[PDB]
């Protein structure tokens, strides 16, 4: 003996925009929940050590959401002006928020009733603050006093390091993720700088010039960093000290970046960017930073962030727009005692239990039970789909006989064949099967066409559909001709 061959479903052949696995994995992000906020959602950060929380930065009101239920769980509203930068320490325990009054405050997580300490920065709005990645207790704050500073939170009274050397509107910081003594900054004249923290820290050891005023500087490796300003993002490498990639597939200036490594995906590394245009686009740092997928939202997206590498639950993409709301696109990952014994100590184990197959279709068991006319009739029920109907038509063509499947019909049951065939003749992959099926039905039912008046209008508008389709295919043949000219 043998088994039974499963009735295949011949899907769509090589149409363009083919389904690549990276766009499959990003395509399965569903349920785009849209949450209103009060003002422009400037900054969004995530929780490092338990990637289950993310912090959003509205005007005067910093919220933190959880990834399990995607509702607001805590607020932070002891801010005397608009609040700008929200960041987490790497042990996930304390939230640093830089506001516009300059008194940059650090709370701890889930306890807004206790401000841990208030760093007095300059009179200028402290526009970005973030903790160090390697060390915990050093905190980088850049205000628009054309300067940035490193504070030790233990010795919170004084600036531990005073990083000057930037001209106009210092705006982003990132630390080189292997050597902790290398701190990279960005300003609004371009000229992405970086400094050694052991040095005096008053001039960059080497600067890198994005010609546009740089908008975000992140690190994806110890070797290469990614800086963006204007309508293109440029990858620089520190070892070659040189720009080596630039993609400009946007309209307006790209406004935020981030990176994710080693997470559960066919695409290993992924750098996604928000672009102030309505699009957030993912780029693949493996093969020369090509674009891979892009989500469109209903206004200029001002920041975006994805869930980190080890999220362990519902993985998130989030993007705060400047219009006043926020987009979350998520993906989600005593008598019967012996009857679980499962054979531990026993000598010889025998196993031939057949797995239950998935449930066969109605037309599949009809063709397998050889009732061919019933297979055709249960095939042309409007509860079925296009590829299923095409495959049962292909099956009856290839194996049985369409003459046999039509040998006992009448005026009535010959209608839904032609009624499907009207929609089926127009598209590409069906029209040959439509052609020979309506050809053999008009071969076999000519005298009933003479008697019965009902399907005559079906034959008439099938003639019109054939004329419409021969006109369309003739002009497409003309386009094939003129491409043969242009080659």
């Amino acid at each position: 003996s043998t088994a039974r061959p499963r009735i295949i479903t011949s899907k769509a052949p090589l149409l363009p925009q083919q389904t690549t696995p990276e766009q499959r994995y990003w395509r399965q992000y569903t349920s785009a929940q849209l949450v209103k906020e009060h003002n422009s959602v400037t900054h969004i950060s995530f929780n490092p050590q338990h990637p289950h929380d993310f912090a959003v930065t509205s005007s005067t009101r910093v919220q933190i959401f959880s990834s399990r239920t995607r509702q607001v769980i805590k607020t932070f509203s002891r801010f005397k002006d608009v609040v700008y930068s929200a960041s987490f320490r790497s042990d996930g325990k304390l939230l640093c928020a830089g506001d516009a009054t300059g008194l940059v405050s650090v709370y701890d997580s889930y306890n807004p009733r206790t401000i841990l300490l208030s760093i007095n920065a300059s009179t200028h709005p402290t526009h970005v603050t973030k903790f160090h990645t390697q060390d915990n207790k050093i905190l980088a704050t850049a205000s628009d006093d054309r300067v940035t500073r490193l504070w030790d939170i233990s010795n919170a009274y004084e600036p531990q390091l005073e990083l000057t050397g930037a001209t106009d509107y210092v705006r982003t910081l990132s630390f080189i993720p292997a050597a902790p003594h290398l701190v990279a900054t960005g300003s609004y004249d371009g000229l992405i700088r970086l400094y050694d923290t052991r040095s005096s820290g008053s001039t960059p050891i080497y600067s890198l010039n994005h010609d546009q005023p740089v908008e975000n500087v992140i690190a994806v490796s110890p070797t290469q960093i990614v800086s963006c300003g204007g309508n293109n993002f440029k990858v620089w490498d520190l070892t070659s000290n040189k720009k080596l990639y630039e993609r400009g597939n946007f309209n307006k200036a790209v406004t935020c970046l981030d990176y994710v490594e080693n997470f559960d995906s066919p695409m290993q590394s992924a750098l996604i960017a928000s672009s102030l245009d309505g699009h957030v686009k993912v780029f693949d740092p493996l093969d020369n930073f090509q674009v891979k997928f892009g989500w469109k939202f209903s206004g200029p997206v001002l920041s975006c962030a994805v869930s980190p590498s080890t999220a362990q639950g519902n993985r998130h993409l989030v993007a705060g727009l400047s219009s006043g709301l926020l987009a979350i696109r998520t993906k989600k990952k005593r008598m019967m005692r012996g009857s679980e014994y499962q054979g531990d100590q026993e000598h010889i184990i025998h196993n031939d239990k057949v797995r239950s197959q998935r449930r066969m279709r109605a037309f599949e068991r009809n063709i397998n039970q050889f009732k061919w006319s019933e297979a055709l009739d249960n095939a042309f029920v409007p509860g079925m789909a296009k590829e299923l109907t095409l495959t049962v038509l292909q099956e009856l063509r290839k194996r049985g006989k369409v003459r046999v499947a039509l040998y006992g019909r009448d005026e009535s049951t010959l209608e839904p064949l032609l009624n499907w065939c009207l929609k089926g003749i127009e598209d590409v992959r069906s029209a040959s099967i439509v052609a020979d099926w309506v050809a053999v039905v008009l071969e076999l039912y000519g005298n009933t066409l003479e008697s019965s008046p009902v399907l005559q209008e079906l034959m008439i508008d099938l003639k019109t559909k054939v004329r419409h389709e021969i006109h369309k295919s003739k002009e497409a043949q003309r386009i094939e001709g003129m491409l043969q000219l242009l080659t």
Binding site: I349, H350, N351
Partner: protein
């Protein structure tokens, strides 16, 4: 614990004759030691065998049973050839032959001589100061039918013509279980439950050496010249003393330790090995009754030895007509 009641190797290590129980009978059997299975049962549970010994001219076994008989039983033919008897219904506790002269002790302290060429009784006698008996051995000095060695809880070298005790050795605190003569003058002895073998001179009564093992013993087997004695211990290991009559001055520790561990991590026991010159016949129960063997090279293996054997423990039954994915 063993379901083999008791077993005995033939001389020159070829056939193991072993008696086990099988539904209140006594499945005796002979197995070659390189498939021999059609071997007999006796009648009911009140006729179990008590001792057994080979005889190597045909080849046969003698079974000293408990009802009062000795059964001379062939091996090539399956039937019992002859049934030696006493006049008493008392339990024969040990038998030993020497050429034609057979000698069986009783449980009622008697001694009987026999001969397996004339098939009749010769002498039927008891002696004083031997109040229990459970071992005896005719001594090797050629056809020295005289000067045999009886043994129970103390060892008595007794004559057959002076017919009285000529020397008395100290035994154990237990009834003796193994007494075997290894030279023309030395004999090893050892009770059950204790780990102590002691060898005795037959002419002085001085305990020359004491052998020790990591457990109490079940059966010993010596070489042809008393230079290697292998005992099987009750925890299922094999302890071989090499060259046990040299001079670590009075009490020799065990030299070679062979135990058999299957390739799933399960220790299987070893009973009744046999060591002639430069080989070892290790026997062990694979299934519940059918035994397997191994001819291990004796002098070249290291001091300890975990012999590996394959055994079914979680093997998926791949059939000769199916595939792996069914």
């Amino acid at each position: 614990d063993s379901p083999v009641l008791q077993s005995a190797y033939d001389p020159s290590g070829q056939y193991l004759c072993y008696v086990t129980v099988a539904l209140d009978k006594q499945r005796v059997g002979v197995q070659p030691t390189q498939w021999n299975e059609n071997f007999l049962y006796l009648e009911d549970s009140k006729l179990k065998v008590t001792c057994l010994k080979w005889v190597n001219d045909t080849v046969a076994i003698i079974l000293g049973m408990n009802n009062g008989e000795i059964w001379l039983y062939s091996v090539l033919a399956n039937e019992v050839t002859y049934k030696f008897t006493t006049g008493n219904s008392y339990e024969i506790k040990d038998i030993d032959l020497m050429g034609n002269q057979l000698w069986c002790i009783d449980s009622s302290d008697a001694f009987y001589q026999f001969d397996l060429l004339q098939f009749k009784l010769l002498q039927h006698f008891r002696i004083n100061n031997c109040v229990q008996l459970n071992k005896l051995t005719i001594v090797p000095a050629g056809d020295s039918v005289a000067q045999l060695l009886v043994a129970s809880h103390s060892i008595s070298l007794i004559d057959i013509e002076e017919k009285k005790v000529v020397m008395t050795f100290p035994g154990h605190v237990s009834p003796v279980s193994t007494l075997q003569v290894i030279t023309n003058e030395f004999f090893i002895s050892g009770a059950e439950g204790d780990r102590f073998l002691n060898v005795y001179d037959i002419h002085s009564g001085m305990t020359k050496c004491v052998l020790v093992a990591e457990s109490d013993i079940k059966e010993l087997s010596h070489s042809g010249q008393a230079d290697s004695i292998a005992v099987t211990t009750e925890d299922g290991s094999l302890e071989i003393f090499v060259d046990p009559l040299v001079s670590g001055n009075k009490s020799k520790k065990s030299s070679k330790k062979i135990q058999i561990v299957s390739k799933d991590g399960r220790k299987v026991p070893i009973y009744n090995a046999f060591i002639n010159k430069d080989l070892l016949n290790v026997s062990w129960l694979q299934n519940a009754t059918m035994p397997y063997f191994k001819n291990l090279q004796w002098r070249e293996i290291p001091n300890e030895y975990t012999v590996e054997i394959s055994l079914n423990w979680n093997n998926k039954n791949k059939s000769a007509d199916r595939d792996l994915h069914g």
